[PDB]
């Protein structure tokens, strides 16, 4: 799967 | 709620 | 897109 | 970091 990154700042990974 | 986007296309995001 | 739900409890949506 | 799974298959989850 792939991990896409984003920020809330706190960094989070969206794993698909 | 907020939606943070890791990618804006296969839109990928986190809703909180 | 589809929103998958999970919990951290706080409920979050993973939008793909 | 923690990984919360919305789905465990096209595994979908949030890494924090």
């Amino acid at each position: 799967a792939k991990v896409f990154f984003a920020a809330d700042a706190a960094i989070i990974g969206l794993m698909v």
Side-chain angles (χ1 to χ4, degrees), chain A:
Chain A
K2 180 168 173 60
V3 184
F4 302 81
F5 297 105
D8 172 9
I11 307 308
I12 60 99
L14 300 187
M15 187 187 313
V16 187

